[PDB]
Amino acid sequence: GKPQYMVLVPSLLHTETTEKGCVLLSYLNETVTVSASLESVRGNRSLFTDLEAENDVLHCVAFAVPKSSSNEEVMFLTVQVKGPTQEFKKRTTVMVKNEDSLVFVQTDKSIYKPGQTVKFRVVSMDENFHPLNELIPLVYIQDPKGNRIAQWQSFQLEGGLKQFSFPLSSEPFQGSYKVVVQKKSGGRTEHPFTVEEFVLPKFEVQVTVPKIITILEEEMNVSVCGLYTYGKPVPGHVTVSICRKYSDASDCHGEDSQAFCEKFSGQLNSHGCFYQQVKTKVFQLKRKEYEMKLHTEAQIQEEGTVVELTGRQSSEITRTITKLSFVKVDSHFRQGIPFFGQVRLVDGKGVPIPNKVIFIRGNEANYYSNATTDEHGLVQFSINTTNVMGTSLTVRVNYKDRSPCYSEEHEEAHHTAYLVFSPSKSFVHLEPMSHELPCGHTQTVQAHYILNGGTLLGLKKLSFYYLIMAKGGIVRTGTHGLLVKQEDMKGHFSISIPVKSDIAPVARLLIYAVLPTGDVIGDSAKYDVENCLANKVDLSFSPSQSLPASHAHLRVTAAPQSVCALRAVDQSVLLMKPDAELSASSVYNLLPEKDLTGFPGPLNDQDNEDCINRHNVYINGITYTPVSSTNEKDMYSFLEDMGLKAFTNSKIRKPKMCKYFPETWIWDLVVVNSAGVAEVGVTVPDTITEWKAGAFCLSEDAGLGISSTASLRAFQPFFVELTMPYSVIRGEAFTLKATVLNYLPKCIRVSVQLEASPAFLAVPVEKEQAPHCICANGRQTVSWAVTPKSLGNVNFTVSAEALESQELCGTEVPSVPEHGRKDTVIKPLLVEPEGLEKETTFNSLLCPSGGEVSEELSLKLPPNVVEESARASVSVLGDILGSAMQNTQNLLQMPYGCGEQNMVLFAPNIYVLDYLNETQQLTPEIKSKAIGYLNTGYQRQLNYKHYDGSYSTFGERYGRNQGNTWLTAFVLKTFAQARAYIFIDEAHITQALIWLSQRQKDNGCFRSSGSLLNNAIKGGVEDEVTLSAYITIALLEIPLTVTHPVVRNALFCLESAWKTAQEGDHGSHVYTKALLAYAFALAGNQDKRKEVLKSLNEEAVKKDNSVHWERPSAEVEMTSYVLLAYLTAQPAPTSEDLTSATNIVKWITKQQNAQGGFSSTQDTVVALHALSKYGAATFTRTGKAAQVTIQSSGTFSSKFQVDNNNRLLLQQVSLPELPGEYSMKVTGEGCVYLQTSLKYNILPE
Ligand SMILES: *[C@@H]1O[C@H](CO)[C@@H](O[C@@H]2O[C@H](CO)[C@@H](O[C@H]3O[C@H](CO)[C@@H](O)[C@H](O)[C@@H]3O)[C@H](O)[C@H]2NC(C)=O)[C@H](O)[C@H]1NC(C)=O
Ligand SMILES: *[C@@H]1O[C@H](CO)[C@@H](O[C@@H]2O[C@H](CO)[C@@H](O)[C@H](O)[C@H]2NC(C)=O)[C@H](O)[C@H]1NC(C)=O
Ligand SMILES: *[C@@H]1O[C@H](CO)[C@@H](O[C@@H]2O[C@H](CO)[C@@H](O)[C@H](O)[C@H]2NC(C)=O)[C@H](O)[C@H]1NC(C)=O
Ligand SMILES: *[C@@H]1O[C@H](CO)[C@@H](O[C@@H]2O[C@H](CO)[C@@H](O)[C@H](O)[C@H]2NC(C)=O)[C@H](O)[C@H]1NC(C)=O
Ligand SMILES: *[C@@H]1O[C@H](CO)[C@@H](O)[C@H](O)[C@H]1NC(C)=O
Ligand SMILES: *[C@@H]1O[C@H](CO)[C@@H](O)[C@H](O)[C@H]1NC(C)=O
Ligand SMILES: *[C@@H]1O[C@H](CO)[C@@H](O)[C@H](O)[C@H]1NC(C)=O
């Protein structure tokens, strides 16, 4: 028959990973060889790869491509054939992008105590989950503000798992922390963990309210169990509530934002938890509702009165009922072989309804069948295939459009099966599957086929091919031969495929059969697969062990000679805030490109080959230009949805014309000895609750696996627990609550005592110390009014034991059951100083600037400060402004719109570009992307001049004869700054200047004559003083001497207007005064600059060691301008200038928002310009060295080295001394910001 070649590769070639490839040869009368060459566009980088080919049977090849300098290069793949019979060449560009290798996170908990450390392991592995060694360049921890407490430079991952033991300071501030592991390929990956002060609770509430609820409902089930230790609910005054939230919940933030709830409360006996039946009258789902959130408080009364606000929102309203859903339906119906659709009836809740008659919209042949549901609500129906283009299948249950005002109907099932292009009237049917593929448990896949006079030369041997793709690449292959010498009809061809970890959550199967007529038939099928892992891991224990059962053998089974990580925490750790899952496809969703939906490359758009014309009418009757505008499903459908390139000699296309510290538990590393490893982890002598754990071992042979959560039921028949707050004031007294628990069946009496220490006082609240009647499943609760004396953390001790052989209340009196009789607990408690706490700040800036500066620490304490309440901290920052740095890069946006609109869009592009350039943090790729936006914005603005430069919204368009004044000054400023990047024609800004000079009366100074629709770009108040001061700084920022007449006449108005706003209303003109400050600063009028800046400082609003202004919307605008005023000095920006300048920068960074837009146009413009100038005046191109040494006049000094690569790091030290006997001398290059603060307490008044 006719020869044909067949080779297939995925069109998202990952750089480093060897991507598999398929070769296939069909009907050649000699052996030939084929070589695939990876040539590159516009550059030279080739990968010649000769892959062997067999004339009848296929095999697989692998080729690894070099790492690309560019991130996503779209380069060619040239598949070539050497052979005397034929020399075939097809070439398309597929993709190469450097794959960001997956990176995990750890850090056991997301709530940490102040004096608690973080262990922080991290795992980085590529698509094939056996890991690789990667040089991670940076990993650091960020505070709520944007500071980096710790930082690690470049390091290598020997095995792919590194622990980073970092301790916190004494009292790190507590809003929320987060950790960033920035991969060497740019885009960082983050993970937070909040820090706060607390006391860990034990009881978990699990209210089982139906998450699924009908729109027609009456009864609400709920049960409230608390298994704080082992399932011993110790029923207390538990209260729950069902809170339906109204539509637009809390969208109206005026005088009312509350939602109506339905509270419930009660107790329990021993085992039944809480059985509350809730009616449905205000459980109104008729209209205006989103979801019932539920918050519960399981107060315990038989112990300390600690309450835990616990909100479980596991309840949602379902708008629909009787949900109908296709589960196993062919998107590929085929003329000749009928298809059967598996449609499923199920309630809107999720329970199928058996024996319900259903009507089916078969829009093909009017196939209306009254099928009824089975026990699973799942029917069967086949539709014969005699139609034109494509069948639409839909289901019927109700027809009803009911009373609703304008929400209550039953959701229907829609599907659009499309025909497969059968050129030789032939096609292969492949059975789809809906159930999740079991792992290990394999599965055979049924298939069907048809010939219709195709196999003329093909006879007695028809191999039947398949290529499973997973993770966006070819994974499994196979073949099977068919014995046919006939005109063979449909057949049953179950094909077997095992299911190992090498299958992604998606499993895609393609089957194509080679035919001697050239044309080939195929069928694709997606398969959802449970995410399984090559290393099945199990966690073993010596469970139900006592708290002092020290040995506590921890056995873990994993792949032979692997590396295992073992995290062990408390159950409360997962209770107070659920931590990262790190399990059950936690890696799989982070996997980039889990499937290839289409040709993944956005640049990979189209293909064009063998386009026929055929624009002629043919055989009549109803020719209608012979064929339907094919929405048909040919092989590009089966291979693009597959996601790979078809390098075929076959014709395929559509023709297509034109007790000790718990705090944690086992966190270590263990190595499998080719059979599995046990670890002897000493269990903590504290009995609090279950200890969940993790196990995510890695190996080079078998990939990563994740085992399970498995606990240690650390329980004692007799123990105590302490109910405390996290801290308490020294001057005040709290009441310690301590309960003593008995659960061994013997009925006993406990004597409870507190061993007092001179660090505190403790007095029982009860007059009598006689032991009370405590028995099985019963507890006593004693108290102590406790006031501490010693500062810092002090650990208490409470001793409870059963008094031996005292015939008492209990009918039987076996007081001491076991060797364990005394229960001595040791638990710390934070002790904060008394009085009102005040913190001052001594923030400052120093620049050695190729030399040396100095500063003396003036630290004094008022006499009313209590003893040892002063905590002095000095922080060395560097501060290249890493806070408002990353979000700024996303202000580079596309220019469009009117003249006014374009300035919203074009202007920020240039100042963000200048900011990134000043901070030395800008990549050439983003610079090239942004320069295009700059040019487009500029050359779209050039289409709005009326004349020499007078702009407006419409401009010369529509024959408008008018002109805006302020907008022209704004564009003059922007182009003046542009001259340094794209060298905007100075003739244009010159013409704009000569037009602005037209608006110049004697001393009136630029009355506005402009009309504009919006005013958000604005921010001057149109007052002649305000506009004059802005336009002067605009047309003087461009290098323009003060002797020039326009600025000379503007400065007279400035001097008169500043006096007039000084003699008149004090304040009320702070924005104008800041503009005057910047104008005088940039015009060299220092003798007036000092006076204006001191007036502003008198009018300033200083809050949290950061100075701000505001009108007594655009409040940030004047802050940036006064920052310029303090920064722009003719001789040099003095140290005193910069020290006050930083106090405005901090809020300018914190004003950022989504994509760092700074909430406005003009504000973003001015703030980015301000930050750029600050960076220019602060940083150093050659700042490769520095030195900061703070010398005490007492005992010890401190030293620091903050160079450019460490300039982000907030190096912080605390020097204990109340007097200011401290001094800093800073030498070397660069600039060093030093913020110093002390916290102290003053009780009296
Ligand atoms: C983007 O890069 C810079 C900001 O990150 C800045 O250009 C820099 O400005 C300095 C200061 O004048 C210049 O350094 C050179 O200045 C003159 C040039 O003849 C000479 O004394 C020395 O050769 C000195 O190196 C440079 O022009 C430049 N420095 C750099 C890039 O290290 C501008 O914001 C932007 N510059 C460009 C070219 O786009
Ligand atoms: C079989 O061997 C013959 C030997 O002559 C070759 O026939 C060539 O077939 C191709 C079609 O694929 C034609 O383009 C050439 O013109 C043929 N050769 C000549 C000399 O005419 C070829 O090696 C093999 N052909 C087939 C169809 O398998
Ligand atoms: C559609 O249903 C009809 C019978 O219900 C069948 O179609 C017949 O097909 C034969 C030959 O294939 C023709 O001679 C008849 O004229 C057809 N009858 C009708 C009513 O179309 C067949 O069972 C179904 N069609 C297919 C392709 O399976
Ligand atoms: C906690 O109490 C103990 C004594 O009651 C002191 O520190 C402990 O001393 C024992 C003595 O062997 C050690 O085994 C423990 O490890 C110590 N505790 C810690 C946390 O290390 C001390 O009075 C208290 N500790 C603190 C930090 O307040
Ligand atoms: C590609 O062509 C350039 C052209 O000068 C040559 O320098 C280079 O060595 C060639 N090979 C590679 C791998 O770049
Ligand atoms: C919900 O409460 C009703 C009220 O009696 C009861 O019949 C039903 O069994 C309860 N549901 C469950 C799951 O127990
Ligand atoms: C069900 O079959 C057809 C399809 O709707 C309908 O005409 C008929 O009346 C129904 N009942 C029976 C007994 O066929």
Curated annotation (Swiss-Prot):
Glycosylation sites: 29, 44, 221, 370, 384, 795, 917
SS bonds (residue pairs): 22-60, 225-273, 243-261, 439-532, 564-697, 611-658, 747-775, 773-809, 847-1231, 1005-1053
One Pfam family here: A2M
Role, per record: Is able to inhibit all four classes of proteinases by a unique 'trapping' mechanism. This protein has a peptide stretch, called the 'bait region' which contains specific cleavage sites for different proteinases. When a proteinase cleaves the bait region, a conformational change is induced in the protein which traps the proteinase. The entrapped enzyme remains active against low molecular weight substrates (activity against high molecular weight substrates is greatly reduced).
Tissue specificity comment: Secreted in plasma.
Superkingdom of the source species: Eukaryota
GO biological process: negative regulation of complement activation, lectin pathway; stem cell differentiation
Single annotated GO MF: signaling receptor binding
Native organism: Homo sapiens (Human)
Cross-linked sites for Isoglutamyl cysteine thioester (Cys-Gln): 898-901
This protein's UniProt keywords: Bait region, Disulfide bond, Glycoprotein, Isopeptide bond, Protease inhibitor, Secreted, Serine protease inhibitor, Signal, Thioester bond
UniProt-listed Gene3D superfamilies: 1.50.10.20, 2.20.130.20, 2.60.120.1540, 2.60.40.1930, 2.60.40.1940, Alpha-macroglobulin, receptor-binding domain, Immunoglobulins
Compartments it resides in: Secreted
The protein's name in its UniProt record: Alpha-2-macroglobulin
Presence of the UniProt keyword Secreted in the record: yes
InterPro entries: A-macroglobulin_rcpt-bd, A-macroglobulin_rcpt-bd_sf, A2M/Complement_sys, A2M_N_BRD, A2M_TED, Alpha-macroglob_thiol-ester_cl, Alpha-macroglobulin_TED, Ig-like_fold
Cellular component terms (Gene Ontology): blood microparticle; collagen-containing extracellular matrix; extracellular exosome; extracellular region; extracellular space; platelet alpha granule lumen
Family classification: Belongs to the protease inhibitor I39 (alpha-2-macroglobulin) family.
SUBUNIT field: Homotetramer; disulfide-linked.
